[PDB]
């Protein structure tokens, strides 16, 4: 019973010019070091590698300490490796075998009592040979989210859908997303599947007296998206069937919380492609305090059209609104809170309270202040809006390390559709704000009120929950030097790096 | 050889009156009792042991207790006094009569080994006194009845009776949430005498894996107050030390949640006494839309005075504010959002948005509406306020079964002093609104922004955490018929039933 341990691009690339295709991945190496060494007393592990893999290592690190180094090679001799560097005392001498079947036979003969776990470390020669013989019980895969130029590739295998879109291998473990040198990645493991408390118990047994899960197989679920998935599953399992303003039935839960890290990667959800062009163009729209939805619509972003139609504005009891007008909406309250609205064309400069500018000036001069809030809810002008704000409130926070976090409260949540859009939108705002203030982005926290999935979306969401997440992408702000204030961002100032989602899921917007 | 004791108990240790139970029928208790005495892991059954009067107090259809070996301790009653009392059913075990508890335990070993699984002393005072003296009691199953009743028979005093009320040891290993039957709150505690299948997943868990705990013995944590206790513990252990607008050192955290049930009992926290006279007077102050802190100050609630002083009013740059005037405070926006403020004496009826009216109306008519929100935060009006509202927003949610839930978001949370007050203050509003809208109260959800403990409380809080919580009380609304609007309520229309909190800890208010 052997295990494979690899780092791998989406297109299964592993090496180039007999070296790693990426810049050094410190957290990947630490993870490698730990897996290959650790043991529950008397036994050391074994690291089986090829010649090209052995050679590609730095001289400093070979032989890999505390582990039986076995090199599969015909051309290299057992003494050339011995003459390469003097051996340090306390380690088994590096062993050379003809092929991989012969390599494991060596452990059967001479090391039957000493070795605990067996690890094949590279490369494509030994990996291919390992999967051929099928003696691999487990695969420890580091999924590099970014694509890199490669000439050596890891062989494709049943259930390699965990890398990109297309005896079996099922994921049992998915870690949260890590990053090094602007390279996002995460760790997965895959399985070859094909009376101190006796007194308490009966009190618990009677105490209960009273269906769907996200990716059942995956038992350790480090990935942060699991929040959102388990949140879908929960409302499908434990929510309440409700009616609606829209006329479409709803399953709703009240009081819901999600939080996502910003320090390593960006929570652009992977289980379905997120319309990022939308979250970007809409956020810049908000920041401008723009209330004209045509400016969005023309850019290819049609998210607001149905709620600013001639038909909808009349039902929303505003016959004197122009098509495209969202009223004094999200962005208007941010940049001009309380100001007298006229139309989308009127210039509202200097009028009202610019919450966004004050939130920054507070962050930049006095970050411990507890009044760093931006609201979109104005009970005075709710009726003048074409549709009341969902994401209505957000608070900011700085710690010791000059790291920035952001809470956002949402009154009403279309989990299937709006939520992943909302996560990504505000997390982006945190990145923007953090940069302008000279702070590290840390964490984004999502507070939810009415949290609901629409009944017509339910079939599509079970489809989404069969999908195990991919590593998060990195969002980079570009022209970091050129942008100094929050209004200096443009659409081209951003870069989504290594975003490899699952295929598009179609979901109708509830009018 | 070891025995378990199973009792229900008044805070004053009372167990009986007039050879019967002191309280009305508690179904959930009798359920607990039935299951705990009966449930057994094959060829095996449980023994129940009682006094003569316990046997007599018990209704005829229930004695002897089915599926359990009954033993009555008596010297007047004989074994044939009981056999003639009711024909024995086929299969059941005969009731045995011993003259003392040592004889009872002796009989159990002498004749009933290999026969009886577990031994339960069931009552009354005499046998509970006897069992505690012998030191044979391994576990105490206490049903803490929170309400004080007329009692002539009492459970004996024991080391560890600090779980009942204020003052070889008996410490809690289990505390459940508060239940209620017939206007009576209660909860269940258990006390203890002290004086590569999945292992291939575990190596990656090694490196990823890594001080103050409250009531650490309590292995089961049903009691919803544990949420708050652990929230204090987390802030201290895992928080970051910030400086403060007041100057006093702060340990703080961002984005933490709590939720409390309102269908069984009231989350008026028990681990320290909460100033309920304040929570009631402050809320009815808000409801009236009052901005005059002297109306609270004259009534014995001085919670706002340190913030309406001439010094603080001038430090907030408001020279013309009279002493007492909070400016457009929380009460003000609730009923007059956007109204132009003058002083506390000016009459504002009709001006601004009456959010509270709109909330109740939307509730009583269109409960599936998601715009059912109230907000104290008014960016344009913040400057004129003596203090920017801490609790700034609440949302209401109505269920399938006409069940009301409420979320409240609080930007800044004094976890030592303000948080339990706020839990109490909105749970009360939720009760009030529910009655006024003809709805069953279900849940209060607390969303928290800057969640912090002051450093001149750290010592005073570590002490509090040593205290395990008592059952929650019931808050009843008196004069239900007379009250039909939210303004109809007065301080007298309420009654806190079964409140048994721990001693007061002195915590100064930060100005
Ligand atoms: N991403 C990752 O996790 C890792 C990537 N790498 C990368 O992989 C590349 C090196 O791997 P690769 O190019 O595939 O070369 P290999 O590491 O597979 O080694 C090739 C040589 O080893 C011998 N060999 C290998 N497999 C067998 C076998 N089954 N039977 C007999 N002999 C065998 C052969 O010798 P002969 O010709 O004499 O038969 C062959 O020439 C480098 O670019 C390196 O950076 C390396 C380690 C980890
Ligand atoms: N809430 C609860 O958990 C429970 C409450 N109760 C309440 O308690 C009351 C009955 O209990 P209580 O009044 O204490 O009476 P008991 O049930 O303790 O029975 C009293 C009789 O039992 C015998 N006896 C008990 N202990 C001893 C001893 N150590 N040595 C010798 N004889 C003993 C004596 O019988 P004799 O005189 O024949 O020798 C005595 O007269 C009822 O009102 C009942 O409702 C009862 C059980 C549980
Ligand atoms: C949230 C928000 C902003 N908005 C505004 C907006 C307004 C009313 C709404 N009403 C309802 N019922 N659900 C919504 O998601 C919604 C969203 C959006 C509107 C539509 C889409 C939409 O049709 N979905 C995108 C997919 C984007 C994604 O991956 O999330 C699409 O493919 O068209 C997204 C966002
Ligand atoms: C929250 C809030 C509203 N308020 C108003 C108010 C105003 C300024 C504040 N400032 C600070 N820093 N913390 C607060 O909790 C606080 C509270 C209160 C203020 C004080 C007390 C107080 O002194 N404690 C109570 C004891 C209550 C308990 O034990 O929990 C007392 O006995 O007076 C209570 C409520
Ligand atoms: C950029 O500098 C650099 N870059 C690389 C090295 C290095 C030094 C020793 C050895 C190696 N490898 C050994 C094996 N590997 C591996 C990494 N992660 C996983 N999950 N599986 C692997 N099988 C990477 C290749 C790499 C030194 N220096
Ligand atoms: C008024 O109706 C009513 N009222 C009372 C009864 C009743 C029926 C069986 C038995 C009894 N006991 C009195 C209460 N006991 C008890 C209850 N909880 C705990 N935790 N420990 C106990 N020792 C034991 C025995 C009471 C029936 N009917
Ligand atoms: O950012 C958004 C915008 C809209 N919605 C969804 C949720 C609601 O179902 C609907 C708005 O309608 P009301 O909540 O106003 O009824 O749009 C979101 O989830 N997020
Ligand atoms: O109802 C209240 C009133 C006050 N505070 C506390 C929290 C903060 O510690 C302090 C307000 O300080 P600023 O957030 O305004 O700085 O008062 C509450 O938690 N709840």
Coordinates of N, CA and C and ligand atoms in Angstrom, one line a residue, chain A residues 245-246 272-275 282 303-304 307 387 391 410 414 416-422 452 454 504-511, ligand 3:
Chain A
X245 N -43.3 38.2 -2.2 CA -43.7 39.3 -3.0 C -43.7 38.9 -4.5
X246 N -42.6 38.2 -4.9 CA -42.4 37.8 -6.3 C -43.4 36.8 -6.8
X272 N -19.7 27.1 -9.0 CA -20.3 27.6 -10.2 C -19.6 28.9 -10.6
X273 N -19.4 29.1 -11.8 CA -18.7 30.3 -12.3 C -19.5 31.6 -11.8
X274 N -18.8 32.5 -11.2 CA -19.3 33.7 -10.7 C -19.1 34.8 -11.7
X275 N -20.1 35.6 -12.0 CA -20.0 36.7 -13.0 C -19.2 37.8 -12.4
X282 N -20.4 46.6 -11.0 CA -21.4 47.0 -10.1 C -20.9 47.7 -8.9
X303 N -27.7 42.8 -14.8 CA -28.2 42.4 -13.5 C -29.4 43.2 -13.0
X304 N -29.5 44.5 -13.4 CA -30.5 45.4 -12.8 C -31.7 45.7 -13.7
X307 N -35.4 45.1 -12.9 CA -35.9 45.8 -11.7 C -35.9 47.4 -12.0
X387 N -36.1 49.4 -5.7 CA -36.0 48.2 -4.9 C -35.1 48.4 -3.7
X391 N -28.1 44.1 0.8 CA -26.9 44.4 1.5 C -27.0 45.9 1.9
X410 N -26.9 41.7 5.5 CA -27.9 41.6 4.4 C -29.2 41.1 4.9
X414 N -30.9 35.7 -1.6 CA -31.1 34.7 -2.6 C -29.8 33.8 -2.7
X416 N -28.8 30.9 -3.9 CA -28.4 30.3 -5.2 C -27.7 31.4 -6.0
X417 N -28.4 32.5 -6.1 CA -28.0 33.6 -7.1 C -27.2 34.7 -6.5
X418 N -27.8 35.5 -5.6 CA -27.3 36.7 -5.1 C -26.1 36.6 -4.2
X419 N -26.1 35.6 -3.3 CA -25.1 35.4 -2.3 C -23.7 35.3 -2.8
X420 N -23.4 34.4 -3.7 CA -22.0 34.3 -4.2 C -21.5 35.6 -4.8
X421 N -22.5 36.3 -5.5 CA -22.3 37.6 -6.0 C -21.9 38.6 -4.9
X422 N -22.7 38.5 -3.8 CA -22.5 39.4 -2.7 C -21.2 39.2 -1.9
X452 N -32.7 32.6 2.0 CA -33.6 31.7 1.3 C -33.1 31.2 -0.1
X454 N -34.9 29.8 -3.6 CA -36.1 29.7 -4.4 C -36.4 28.3 -4.8
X504 N -20.8 26.7 -15.9 CA -21.9 27.6 -15.6 C -23.1 26.9 -15.3
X505 N -23.8 27.4 -14.2 CA -25.2 26.9 -13.9 C -26.1 28.1 -14.1
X506 N -27.2 27.8 -14.9 CA -28.2 28.8 -15.2 C -29.3 28.8 -14.2
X507 N -29.5 30.0 -13.6 CA -30.5 30.3 -12.7 C -31.3 31.6 -13.0
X508 N -32.6 31.5 -13.1 CA -33.4 32.6 -13.4 C -33.5 33.6 -12.3
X509 N -33.4 34.9 -12.6 CA -33.6 36.0 -11.6 C -35.1 36.2 -11.3
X510 N -35.4 36.2 -10.0 CA -36.8 36.4 -9.6 C -37.1 37.9 -9.8
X511 N -38.0 38.2 -10.7 CA -38.4 39.6 -11.1 C -38.9 40.4 -10.0
Ligands
LIG3 C1 -26.5 39.9 -5.8 C2 -26.7 40.8 -6.7 C3 -26.8 41.9 -7.7 N1 -28.0 41.6 -8.5 C4 -29.1 42.5 -8.4 C5 -30.3 41.7 -8.0 C6 -31.6 42.3 -8.0 C7 -32.7 41.5 -7.7 C8 -32.6 40.2 -7.4 N2 -33.6 39.4 -7.1 C9 -33.5 38.1 -6.8 N3 -34.6 37.4 -6.5 N4 -32.3 37.5 -6.8 C10 -31.1 38.1 -7.1 O1 -30.0 37.5 -7.1 C11 -31.2 39.6 -7.4 C12 -30.1 40.3 -7.8 C13 -28.0 40.5 -9.3 C14 -29.1 40.3 -10.2 C15 -29.1 39.2 -11.0 C16 -28.1 38.3 -11.0 C17 -28.1 37.1 -11.9 O2 -29.0 37.0 -12.8 N5 -27.2 36.1 -11.8 C18 -25.9 36.2 -12.5 C19 -24.9 35.2 -11.9 C20 -24.0 36.0 -11.0 C21 -23.5 35.0 -9.9 O3 -22.7 34.2 -10.2 O4 -23.9 35.2 -8.7 C22 -26.2 35.8 -13.9 O5 -25.6 34.9 -14.4 O6 -27.0 36.6 -14.6 C23 -27.0 38.5 -10.2 C24 -27.0 39.6 -9.3

